[PDB]
Amino acid sequence: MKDYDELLKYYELHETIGTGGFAKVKLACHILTGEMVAIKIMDKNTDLPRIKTEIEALKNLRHQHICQLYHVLETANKIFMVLEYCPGGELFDYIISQDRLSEEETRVVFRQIVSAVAYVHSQGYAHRDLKPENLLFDEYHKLKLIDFGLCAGALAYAAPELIQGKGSEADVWSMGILLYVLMCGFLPFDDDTAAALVAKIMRGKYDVPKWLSPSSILLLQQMLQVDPKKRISMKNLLNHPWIMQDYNYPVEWQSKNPFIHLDDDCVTELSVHHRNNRQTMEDLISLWQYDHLTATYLLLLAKKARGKPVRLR
Amino acid sequence: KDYDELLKYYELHETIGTGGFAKVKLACHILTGEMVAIKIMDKNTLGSDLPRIKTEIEALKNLRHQHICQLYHVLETANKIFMVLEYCPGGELFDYIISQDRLSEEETRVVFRQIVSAVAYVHSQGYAHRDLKPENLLFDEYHKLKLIDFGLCAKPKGNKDGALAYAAPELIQGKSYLGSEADVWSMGILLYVLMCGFLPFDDDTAAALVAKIMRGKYDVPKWLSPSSILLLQQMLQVDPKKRISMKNLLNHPWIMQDYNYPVEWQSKNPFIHLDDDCVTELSVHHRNNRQTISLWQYDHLTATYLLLLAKKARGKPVRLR
Ligand SMILES: OCC#Cc1ccc2ccncc2c1
Ligand SMILES: OCC#Cc1ccc2ccncc2c1
């Protein structure tokens, strides 16, 4: 197949592992690094603006809690997105397998969600589709935010002002719904029709189960404010008393994953693969075209970060 | 929830894949303990693909075959359609093709006789699949093919309603067809990609692919046996009236080679002849009498009966907790 010729120069394709925005996701191996990847396969003959908004957000976003874009390939009838492999499943799966999570367990997970969304917002974006299906665990059981198809969703996770049509404050409401579903195992607003769900969201009344601590209840009232001018700010969420209870330091949201600083060990290994001198290699890396080069650089950087040698072939 | 009625019957596991444009999850059927694939359709998200879901469900209600991935249970809620299906952990025929060089003729025959079986059964039921491709064939846990994705299936003689490389000439132009001849073309495309590792008609644009399909001219690689070449010419006839019939495909010499018996296409999976170890265990658990199951509503009863029948076929006890 001519649709897979350029792909298979770079990647050893494995089995179907899932789904991403109606696109199939397959396991693969990046050949040069030996590193495992997720490949999202789009058919461009069978939601094209959604694909392009995602790609363009993922080109500008780079963070420890955002599932990394490595490589975009485009053929006759296909778009391939080479992404960070998350074998740990969805946060959805995790919620439904236990009944809910304990307060201590959802702090661990929720501090990662806060980190990622605080970073998204600092870049001038709102994700506009925060939900547990859209968070995946990596090999180290750390959350990675996916689905950037809406940018700057599920009705149950949508803010009041969003349903009215009257942008980053709506994400805080969506993290509130998330906080609740984690500790409860059910949504705070749920109905059999869309109009009854909408009316529930507009009222802002929800059950407070017995097992919820007063600290949990306070944070939920601050995030699940129907008035977005009354909603908790990102600033005050970061060092909220609930957020800092077992970790007496605020959420570190700032990216540890740069666009500007280049790892010298990776540049010298890329130079020996390419047969060239630095500054030709750095200038090439710094272009960030989301081609085989950025894939290999970022996966060499991920190889180095797991302790394994910063080596190619 | 959206998941309240589902979770009475199934223990949900992880996301394993995609069916059409919908999530597939691993699950366990609580009563029988048997593993299951659950296709999840969001009702107010997919919209324009709702008639595709209903065409699949209605075909899968009327098709029951050893080489068709089995429908157990349809659940419909507020914002969801669940299809509970036969678990196929062996991956796609696509994966098998892309993992190695071309298959040997003998490897192809093994696999291709199963494709013929399934499609001859589909056609005997008055259907045409219309989307035959190696992504729509899955291996079960004993490495046997199961036909999937009936969203574009049609009754060619009934009431009215794929991949371009697999599409028949008359299908790209839209002719007055008995519709099942287009599936024979697609199996010929399949036969070629299996023995060659590449498609007989392939281009960088859709218009150049279409024109190649209309001409009907393709390379015959050196490694292809004369037997293979003959069968390919019979199936890859551009005139659907000149294409090999299902009848002559079933006992074709290439097909018969090494096996020396024709493809057995008729279903070993009945709607009528109930194996009553299942009926008697369905009578003890569900406290009522043996005057049936035969309604086949694709509810929890259909699922449990068919999975009990599967659990018996595995050797495991005919038991309902
Ligand atoms: O941000 C777009 C994406 C994605 C995505 C979807 C499913 C995956 C499964 C496993 N590993 C990574 C994945 C990434
Ligand atoms: O014909 C409808 C169907 C289906 C389907 C799709 C994906 C699967 C993955 C694993 N096991 C069974 C599956 C069935």
UniProtKB/Swiss-Prot annotation, chain A:
Source organism, top-level taxon: Eukaryota
Localization: Cell membrane
Family as reported in the entry's similarity comment: Belongs to the protein kinase superfamily. CAMK Ser/Thr protein kinase family. SNF1 subfamily.
Modified residues (Phosphoserine): A154, S233
Further remarks about this protein from its record: Potential therapeutic target for treatment of somatic tumors, such as brain and breast cancers, down-regulation of MELK inhibiting tumorigenesis.
Disease: Defects in MELK are associated with some cancers, such as brain or breast cancers. Expression is dramatically increased in aggressive undifferentiated tumors, correlating with poor patient outcome in breast and brain cancers, suggesting a role in tumor-initiating cells and proliferation via its function in cell proliferation regulation.
Induction: Up-regulated in many cancers cells. Up-regulated upon treatment with radiation or 5-fluorouracil (5-FU) in colorectal cancer cells, suggesting that it might be associated with increased resistance of colorectal cells against radiation and 5-FU. Down-regulated upon siomycin A, a thiazole antibiotic, treatment, leading to inhibit tumor growth in vivo.
Role: Serine/threonine-protein kinase involved in various processes such as cell cycle regulation, self-renewal of stem cells, apoptosis and splicing regulation. Has a broad substrate specificity; phosphorylates BCL2L14, CDC25B, MAP3K5/ASK1 and ZNF622. Acts as an activator of apoptosis by phosphorylating and activating MAP3K5/ASK1. Acts as a regulator of cell cycle, notably by mediating phosphorylation of CDC25B, promoting localization of CDC25B to the centrosome and the spindle poles during mitosis. Plays a key role in cell proliferation and carcinogenesis.
Outcome, altering C184A: Abolishes dependence to reducing agents
Residues of the full protein shown: 1 to 333 of 651
Organism: Homo sapiens
Annotated Protein kinase domain residues: 11-243
Residues the record marks as active site: D129
Subunit details: Monomer. Interacts with ZNF622 and PPP1R8.
Name of the protein this chain belongs to: Maternal embryonic leucine zipper kinase
Recorded domain comment: The KA1 domain mediates binding to phospholipids and targeting to membranes.
Effect of C29V: Abolishes dependence to reducing agents
Gene name, Swiss-Prot/TrEMBL: MELK
Residues involved in ATP binding: I17, G18, T19, G20, G21, F22, A23, K24, V25, K40
Modified residues (Phosphothreonine): T53
Tissues in which the protein is found: Expressed in placenta, kidney, thymus, testis, ovary and intestine.
Curated annotation (Swiss-Prot), chain B:
Keywords: Apoptosis, ATP-binding, Calcium, Cell cycle, Cell membrane, Kinase, Lipid-binding, Membrane, Nucleotide-binding, Phosphoprotein, Serine/threonine-protein kinase, Transferase
Domain comment in the entry: The KA1 domain mediates binding to phospholipids and targeting to membranes.
Misc remark: Potential therapeutic target for treatment of somatic tumors, such as brain and breast cancers, down-regulation of MELK inhibiting tumorigenesis.
Compartments where located: Cell membrane
Impact noted for substituting C153A: Abolishes dependence to reducing agents
Reported effect, C88A: Abolishes dependence to reducing agents
Phosphoserine PTM positions: A163, S245
GO annotation, biological process: apoptotic process; cell population proliferation; G2/M transition of mitotic cell cycle; hemopoiesis; intrinsic apoptotic signaling pathway in response to oxidative stress; neural precursor cell proliferation; positive regulation of apoptotic process; protein autophosphorylation
Entry comment describing in which tissues the protein is expressed: Expressed in placenta, kidney, thymus, testis, ovary and intestine.
Transmembrane segments: none
Outcome following mutation: C278A: Abolishes dependence to reducing agents
GO molecular function, one term: calcium ion binding
Effect of D149A: Abolishes enzymatic activity
Keyword Calcium: yes
Effect recorded for C69V: Abolishes dependence to reducing agents
Record-stated family: Belongs to the protein kinase superfamily. CAMK Ser/Thr protein kinase family. SNF1 subfamily.
Sites where the protein binds ATP: I16, G17, T18, G19, G20, F21, A22, K23, V24, K39
Consequence when changing C28V: Abolishes dependence to reducing agents
Residues of the full protein shown: 2 to 333 of 651
Phosphothreonine carried by residues: T55
Protein known as: Maternal embryonic leucine zipper kinase
Positions annotated as active site in the UniProt record: D131
Induction field: Up-regulated in many cancers cells. Up-regulated upon treatment with radiation or 5-fluorouracil (5-FU) in colorectal cancer cells, suggesting that it might be associated with increased resistance of colorectal cells against radiation and 5-FU. Down-regulated upon siomycin A, a thiazole antibiotic, treatment, leading to inhibit tumor growth in vivo.
Any one Gene Ontology cellular component term annotated for this protein: plasma membrane
Reported function: Serine/threonine-protein kinase involved in various processes such as cell cycle regulation, self-renewal of stem cells, apoptosis and splicing regulation. Has a broad substrate specificity; phosphorylates BCL2L14, CDC25B, MAP3K5/ASK1 and ZNF622. Acts as an activator of apoptosis by phosphorylating and activating MAP3K5/ASK1. Acts as a regulator of cell cycle, notably by mediating phosphorylation of CDC25B, promoting localization of CDC25B to the centrosome and the spindle poles during mitosis. Plays a key role in cell proliferation and carcinogenesis.
Lineage of source species: Eukaryota, Metazoa, Chordata, Craniata, Vertebrata
